[PDB]
Amino acid sequence: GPLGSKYECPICLMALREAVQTPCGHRFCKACIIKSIRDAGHKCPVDNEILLENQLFPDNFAK
């Protein structure tokens, strides 16, 4: 639809579910990134940095 993502998961083009931040600094949905790294390869699709499941940390939005 509208073009212009604001903290969005490019994998599903949906708003971030549970928001898991990578060490790369990119936040993805807690499932989309997992199903992209243990299925295709361990990388963030945007910029191809090596991403591991244990390296993912849910973002604290309670601040």
- Positions touching Zn ion (CB under 5 A) are 9, 11-12, 14, 24, 26, 29, 32, 44, 47, 49
Cβ within 8 Å of residue 56, ≥6 positions away: 20, 21, 22, 30, 33, 34
- Taking the complex as a whole, the smallest distance from the CB of residue 56 to Zn ion amounts, in Å, to 12
Residue 25 Cβ vs Zn ion, minimum distance, rounded to whole Å: 7
> What is the smallest separation between the CB atom of 42 and Zn ion, expressed in angstroms?
12
Closest residue by Cα to residue 9 from 30, 23, 38, 40: 30
Q: Which is nearer to Zn ion, 12 or 59 (CB)?
A: 12
Strand-pair partners of 43: 50
